[PDB]
């Protein structure tokens, strides 16, 4: 922090700025299944009638709903196709029938829930399992609706809600809430996503349904959002590698900036089961074993910006509508993204791979170029400045697109428009 | 100050203009926490029922509301994660639970509050902590809403208030008011932001919740405005360096003007803990000890204008909507900003940082220009006159934007339009 | 405080019988006057000429250590402590409910 200002005599002043985060990682050393604390065990059918009436009445108690969802986990059971171990060995083994309760630890206290029958809706007999499944799915789907809040998302929320309702009103599920009840409860239950126990249970359900196929696997439609939650950065990177046809290692070579270093270390920390198909990691944020995610689009802001800027240059709609992380030097990211997209748009690395004869193969072996070094030199020659063609492509993509409020498309349009 | 005029003889006249501002800095030399006086501790049940009736009836008493919040701030307690030292006060010890009351001293007075009931409510029993916290948040949110008042605010005030209602009607908070009750009280509390004690406590709450995570941390939505309040110049400087991807020191070198000197010294004056993350500095304006902020946009106007002018050149929407400081030579700032924006727009400093094998670093180690000097020379060559291309860029940005009343966008459109 | 509670309850059209009764018994001290002549109600000297008496002086009221809720339910606009008339007007309106 060196600086010199000149008054009548020369004076020196230092600058001061503050930035720091924690970024705790998910792997657990104690090997203790995620734990949630809930109330006294529910009265079976009585908890079902209270919450269903509450649904039609759009009044629900969070603690009671959580206890009902924990009890309903015993209803859903399936045989495990393969032996299952995540972090400390999971108990599930090949061919073993399991419940969702087996995946996480649920802790119950002496205090009993209100289980009140707020709605005038009445059920003469004890409910059947499908009815229970239909309610569990409808309750879980509120979580998804709670997450999808934002500008101009009204018609879209209703469309997903209608899809949710038709799934749970048709077999193997039975219609228990008629129509439009799901939207009205969501109006009163818009911030239910913030509730920790509700998120914990949704993640548990999604983990169980992903591994074990079930008749009521359609319940996952509410809980799909829990998978890879707050890991968009990592998710964007893995797609970027696949779309670009790079080996991931090679892809990092193209990241020519000092800022990427911290992010690359952040997302690739060892010991986290980023490498296991059905591990706790996929639902780590939803489950208790989490912190602010080091894999979020903000935690890896520069890499995320670069990825979608390249995506925009290649016309990837997902990138066009993703929201840019404004803090992480988007302009520099766009320039580098411009060059990388130029390299990757409309070009492929093709080589003859299939031959009629081994001799033919050997002859082909006896016999402008895509490399990180070539790209870096090209950037260096133009002084780290975008080419006119980069700008034209960017503008052509952005303008012929319905630019969303804070999307990359909007950033491109506002930035390069003449 | 010499002037000579000839009116049938030689005449000498002096010219005098007045220009002085105190710009006092926040002092922690007294080693005493900030203090306010308030009325006698209210009846827990009566204060809650009175304010709730008042809210539905849009009638609120400021001294009564302030004492109730001061009573409820004792309820909020949490453990301190790490050792917490203010600038001259040891505010906390690591592993010691603390309250907002531990942050600042409030002195009670023999004057009792009226706690009168404006309309009838259903509640007849003593209130629980959640109810108390839900009301505290709704009351604190009025402060943000009064600040939000201004000349063309569409329905932005209404939507932000709707969010506040949702926060405090969902768990861990309990719903105490029907929807839109906050909007009606806000109409009566449009200038509630001016009240000093209400300002002081809102800052106290925000500081406490920022250091210590709490179940009721969502109360910060009202008090978030107190953070870095009236320090927009400093905040704009920090964003400018990060977006521009330069170090604070390197960035100030490009500021080629005499006027900047006083402002730079003023905002980087030593003895203020800007670098400390949870220092008193972050909420100093809300608590007190500063009649006028030296880090306010007006105090550091020349810097402020140059920063957003560069942002407009780069198409940053925040800069486009920021209100220009007319006094601090905006035209001259815009010219420097055109050149500075020219240097930083569409250009990035790229270096290879990732290589395949350890051997590759040594190979890469074996070996226009972005510098303050090059820009300064480029300006001197054009004699301090904006290039035509600079004017076009400014014009292209302003015309394709919904220019707000006194915004930088409006200044650009009005200044350079043919 | 009791006057404010019952007045709010009156306005809220919801009244708690126990607090209403305690308020009326408490308010009995406000109404006092000298007895014109010697008073023998039923072999008991309730009053003597020139002796100041209240409704409380006629019947002994037993108060238990247990206190009532005296809660605020309805709209009461008094920002100040109530005056004696104010006390008497409420006592009359409450007592008139019996006749209704």
TrEMBL record, chain C:
Superkingdom, natural source = Viruses
- Presence of keyword DNA-binding: no
UniProt keyword annotation of Nucleotide-binding present:
no
Main subcellular location:
host cell
Q: Which GO terms describe its cellular component?
A: helical viral capsid; host cell cytoplasm; ribonucleoprotein complex; viral nucleocapsid
Which Gene Ontology molecular function entries are recorded, alphabetically? RNA binding
Instruction: Tell me which UniProt keywords the record has, alphabetically.
Output: Capsid protein, Helical capsid protein, Host cytoplasm, Phosphoprotein, Ribonucleoprotein, RNA-binding, Viral nucleoprotein, Virion
Q: Tell where it localizes.
A: Host cytoplasm; Virion
Similarity section: Belongs to the lyssavirus nucleocapsid protein family.
This protein is called: Nucleoprotein
């Amino acid at each position: 922090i060196v600086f010199k200002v000149n008054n009548q005599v020369v004076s020196l002043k230092p600058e001061i700025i503050v930035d720091q985060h924690e970024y705790k990682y998910p792997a657990i050393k104690d090997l203790k299944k995620p734990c949630i604390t809930l109330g006294k065990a529910p009265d079976l059918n009585k908890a079902y009638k209270s919450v269903l009436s509450g649904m039609s009445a759009a009044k629900l108690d969070p603690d009671d709903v959580c206890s009902y969802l924990a009890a309903a986990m015993q209803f859903f059971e399936g045989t495990c196709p393969e032996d299952w171990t995540s972090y400390g060995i999971v108990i599930a083994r090949k061919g073993d029938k399991i419940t969702p309760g087996s995946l996480v630890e649920i802790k119950r206290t002496d205090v009993e829930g209100n289980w009140a029958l707020t709605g005038g809706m009445e059920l003469t007999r004890d409910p059947t399992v499908p009815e229970h499944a239909s309610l569990v799915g409808l309750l879980l789907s509120l979580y998804r609706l709670s997450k999808i809040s934002g500008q101009n998302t009204g018609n879209y929320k209703t469309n997903i809600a209608d899809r949710i309702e038709q799934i749970f009103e048709t077999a193997p599920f039975v219609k228990i809430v008629e129509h439009h009840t799901l939207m009205t409860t969501h109006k009163m239950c818009a911030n239910w996503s913030t509730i920790p126990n509700f998120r914990f249970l949704a993640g548990t359900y999604d983990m169980f349904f992903s591994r074990i196929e079930h008749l009521y696997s359609a319940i996952r439609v509410g809980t799909v959002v829990t998978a890879y939650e707050d890991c968009s950065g990592l998710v964007s990177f893995t797609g970027f590698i696949k779309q670009i046809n790079l080996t991931a290692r090679e892809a990092i070579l193209y990241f020519f900036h000092k800022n990427f270093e911290e992010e690359i270390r952040r997302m690739f920390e060892p010991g986290q089961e980023t490498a296991v198909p059905h591990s706790y990691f996929i639902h780590f944020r939803s489950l208790g074993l989490s912190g602010k995610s080091p894999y979020s689009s903000n935690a890896v802001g520069h890499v995320f910006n670069l990825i979608h800027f390249v995506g925009c240059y290649m016309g990837q709609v997902r990138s066009l509508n993703a929201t840019v992380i404004a803090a992480c030097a988007p302009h520099e990211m766009s320039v580098l993204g411009g060059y990388l997209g130029e390299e990757f748009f409309g070009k492929g690395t093709f080589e003859r791979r299939f031959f009629r004869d081994e001799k033919e193969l050997q002859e082909y072996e006896a016999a402008e170029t895509r490399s990180p070094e070539a790209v870096y030199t090209r950037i260096m020659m133009n002084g780290g400045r975008l080419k006119r063609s980069h700008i034209r492509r960017y503008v052509s993509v952005s303008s012929n697109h319905q630019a969303r409020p804070n999307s990359f498309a909007e950033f491109l349009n506002k930035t390069y428009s003449s």
